[PDB]
Amino acid sequence: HHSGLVKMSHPSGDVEACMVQVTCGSMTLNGLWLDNTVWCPRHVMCPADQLSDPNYDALLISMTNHSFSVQKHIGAPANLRVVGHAMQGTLLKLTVDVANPSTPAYTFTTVKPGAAFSVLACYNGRPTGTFTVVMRPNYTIKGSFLCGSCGSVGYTKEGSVINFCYMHQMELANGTHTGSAFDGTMYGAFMDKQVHQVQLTDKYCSVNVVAWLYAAILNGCAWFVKPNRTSVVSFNEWALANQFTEFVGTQSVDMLAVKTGVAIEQLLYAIQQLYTGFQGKQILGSTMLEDEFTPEDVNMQIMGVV
Amino acid sequence: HHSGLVKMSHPSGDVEACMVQVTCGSMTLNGLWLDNTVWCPRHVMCPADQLSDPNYDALLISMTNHSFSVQKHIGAPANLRVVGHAMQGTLLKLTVDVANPSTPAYTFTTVKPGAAFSVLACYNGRPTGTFTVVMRPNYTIKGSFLCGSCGSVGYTKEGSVINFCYMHQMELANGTHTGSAFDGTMYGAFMDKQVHQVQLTDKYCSVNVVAWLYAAILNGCAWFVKPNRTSVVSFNEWALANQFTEFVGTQSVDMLAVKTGVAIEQLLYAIQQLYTGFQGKQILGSTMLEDEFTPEDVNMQIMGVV
Ligand SMILES: *[C@H](O)[C@H](C[C@@H]1CCNC1=O)NC(=O)[C@H](CC(C)C)NC(=O)OC[C@@H]1CCC(=O)N1Cc1ccc2c(c1)OC(F)(F)O2
Ligand SMILES: *[C@H](O)[C@H](C[C@@H]1CCNC1=O)NC(=O)[C@H](CC(C)C)NC(=O)OC[C@@H]1CCC(=O)N1Cc1ccc2c(c1)OC(F)(F)O2
Fold first, then answer.
1. Is B174 in contact with A1 (Cβ distance < 8 A)?
2. Quick check: B40 and B22 in contact, CB under 8 A?
3. Where is the Peptidase C30 domain positioned along the sequence (chains A, B)?
4. Cβ atoms within 10 Å of A289's Cβ, excluding its own
C-alpha cells in the first residue's frame, strides 16, 4: 500500500525565469535576477588559491562593474550590464541596467528546521532539476549539488508569491549542504570559506515524525496507536536525551488530530516506543521513523487541504 | 552520511506553459495544449452516474465542439475555442483555433518499468506541484494525486526536447496510480472505467537496486561487496522466484562498474544475500533494498555525468 506521499516540489517556472549566470574572471556560478538586482554568492569574487581564507572586504573593493559578467540563457537570452555592486553578508547584490520582466511577486524569508522548501538546481545559469528538502536541525539540507551549483535557490510559495529562503554555498564533510538566506547570513554557524567546519549533530524532527505517523493512520495503518499518552512537556524532556527536536504543536498538526481522532500525545508516546524498535513491523513501508514530511505535506497531499 | 541522492524532477516551466483546464458539462480536468491540439482524458465526457461503465463511442458521437470549454489560467490567460474533436484510445484530441505559442520541442514516448519520469500535478488547469516517479513493474506509479488531477502529465527530457509519456487517469485500490500514454493506450492491463480492477504483483526493479548499491559504493559504503559473483543468467532465474525483475545491463550501469571497479555480478550476488536480510546493517541509511533510483540518476547526481 502506497501512502500517497511523495517528495513534492513547487512548479519551478516562475523561478527558472529569474536564474542567470554570473562570472567574475575564472569563477562562474548562478545568480537570481529580481527587479534590477542580481543576487549571487560572494565567493564568485574569490580566486581558487584563496578560497580557504578570502578577505572578502578587500576582494569587494578590488572589484569594478567591469569585473562581473551576467548572462541569461533560457527563454529570453540576454547579457545584463552591471551598474552597481555591493556585498550583504555572504551574498553579492549586483545592480543591473535591465529589470527582469519576469520578476514574480516575492519576499525573502528564513526557513526553520523541520520546514520544507523547493530547490532549483542550476549549473552555468541553466536550471537542471528541482527537488524538495527539509531544513535539518543542524542547519544543513540533504540536497544534490555538484561543482558549479552555487547560487542555486531554495524557496517556498504562498499563493502566487515566491518566498526565497536559500542560496546554495557549500557541501559539508558528511555530504549534506548549506547556504545563505537572502539577508546574507549563512544558516547555522557555517562560514563561506573552503575549510573543514565543525557541524552540529543532527536530530529527528519530532513534529514531522508525528505528521508521518498521522499519514500512516490516514492510510489505515495504526497498529502503533495505544491509549497510552505522553505529554508534550514530558516528551520534550525525553527528546533532549534522545536526539529529537522538542515538539511544538501547530494548527496543521491539530487538523490531523481532528481528522484522525488520535491525540498528539498518543503519537508522542508511540514515538518513544518506536524509537526503541519497530519489532519487525513496518509503518508505510519503513522500518525507521520518517521526518522528511511536514504536517502541511500530509494535509495537502493526503487530505487535499492547503 | 547523506548519499547525495534526492528525488530529482526536471524543471517544469516548459510544461507548465502547456497546461489548460478542460470542461465538458459538470466534468472538469486538465489537458495538455501542444500546437493546435489539446489532449485530455476521455472520461471528461462521462457523467458521474456512468463512470462505472461508459460507452465512450456513444459519448463521443454525442459531443459537439460546443460541448468542450478549454481555458488557460497561468501566465498567458485564454479561452481556446474547440474546432474539432476526436478520440484516440483513452484520450481525447481536441483541435483548437489557437496554436500554443509556448509549445516546446516535444515527442511522445512510452516509459518502461524501472524508468523514471517527472510529473506535473495540476488541478483545474493550474500546476500545483512536481515530483518524480519510477514506472513500477506492474505499470503503476507511486504518485500523489487527488480528485481533479486527471490530465496531469508525466514526461522526460532529452536536451531541450520534452518526451511526454504519461497522462494521469486513475487511482488503484492500493493507493498507486496509473494513466495513459499519448498513443491513448493505458499502461498495463488497466481500463479507464470506475471499477475495481485486478492489479498485477509489483516487483523489485533489479537494475535500480544495482544502481543504488553502486551509489553506496560511490559514497564509501561497500561492506556488502564480496568477491563472490552471481551471473546474470543465474540471477535472473533467482529473480523469477523472488519477486525481482530480470536484470538487463545498460551502458549507464557499465559506467558505474568502471568508475567503482565493482562488477555487476558482485552486486547481483549481494542482492541475493541482502534480500534474505541486512543483518542489522544499513546501506545509505536504509535497512531495505531501494529501487526508486535509476542508473542514470546515480550517474547524473553523484558522478555529474549526463
Ligand atoms: C559552489 O558551486 C560549490 C558547491 C559545492 C561543490 C561540491 N558540491 C557542492 O555543493 N561550493 C564550494 O565548493 C564551496 C565554496 C566555499 C568558498 C564556500 N567550498 C566547499 O564546499 O569546500 C569544502 C567544504 C567547506 C566546508 C567543509 O567542511 N568542506 C570540506 C569538505 C570535506 C569533505 C567533504 C566535503 C566537504 O563534501 C563532501 F563531499 F561531502 O566531502
Ligand atoms: C481523475 O481526476 C481521477 C483521479 C483519481 C481521484 C483520486 N485520486 C486519483 O488519482 N480519476 C478517477 O477518479 C478515476 C476515473 C475513471 C473513469 C478512470 N476513477 C477511479 O480512480 O475509480 C476508482 C478506481 C478505478 C480502478 C480501481 O481499482 N478503483 C477502485 C478503488 C478502490 C479503492 C481505492 C482506490 C480505488 O483508490 C484508493 F484510494 F487507493 O483506494
1. yes
2. yes
3. 3-306
4. 19
Name the CATH architecture for the domain at A203-306.
Orthogonal Bundle (1.10)
The distance of Cα B158 from the centroid of its chain, to the nearest Å, equals 16
Helices B206-218 and B251-260: crossing angle in degrees, nearest 10, is: 30
Are the C-beta atoms of B163 and B108 separated by less than 8 Å?
Answer: yes
Neighbours of A207 (CB within 10 A): 23
The residue assigned the cell 495538455 is B32
Task: Please give the full DSSP string across B220-271, using - where no structure is assigned.
Answer: T--TT--S----HHHHHHHHHHHTBPPP---HHHHHHHHHH---HHHHHHHH
Cell triple for residue B171?
487511482
The alpha-carbon gap from A286 to the nearest alpha carbon of chain B, in Å, equals: 8
Atom of ligand 1 nearest to the CA of A199: 28
Residue ranges per structural domain of chain A: 1-16+105-202, 17-104, 203-306
Contact indicator for A77, A69 with CB cutoff of 8 Å: no
Ramachandran region of residue B124, left (φ > 0), alpha (ψ -120 to 50) or beta? left
Angstrom resolution of this structure: 1.8
Q: Judge: A175–B143 Cβ closer than 8 Å, yes or no.
A: no
| Identity of residue A23 | T
State the distance between the two ends of chain A, measured CA to CA, in whole angstroms. 24
**Across the interface, which of B120, B127, B301 has its CB nearest the CB of A144?**
B301
Active site residue A150: yes
The answer to whether domain B1-16+105-202 and domain B203-306 are alike in fold is: no
Amino acid, res. A13: G
Tell me the C-alpha distance between A85 and A164, whole Å: 21
Closest CA to B16 of A17, A99, A302, A76: A17
* CATH architecture label of A1-16+105-202: Beta Barrel (2.40)
- State the amino acid at position A21 in one-letter form: Q
Q: How many residues does chain A have?
A: 306
Distance of CA B24 to the CA centre of its chain: 26
* Torsions phi, psi for A187 (to 5 deg): -60, 145
Cβ contacts of residue B92 below 8 Å, gap of 6+? B22, B38, B39, B40, B41, B42, B44, B45, B85, B86
What backbone torsions phi and psi does residue B215 show, to the nearest 5 degrees? -60, -40
Paired residues of B177 in beta bridges: B141, B171
Count Cα neighbours of B225 within 13 Å in the Cβ-side half-sphere: 17
Q: How far is B17 from chain A (nearest CA, A)?
A: 9
**Contact, A70 vs A22, CB < 8 A?**
yes
Instruction: State the Cα–Cα distance between residues B241 and B101, nearest whole angstrom.
Output: 52
A176 touches chain B (CB under 8 A): yes
Query: Atom 32, ligand 2: which residue's CA is nearest?
Result: B173
Nearest to A14, CA basis, from A118, A110, A91, A94: A118
Chain discontinuities in chain A, listed by preceding residue (C to N exceeding 2.5 Å) = none
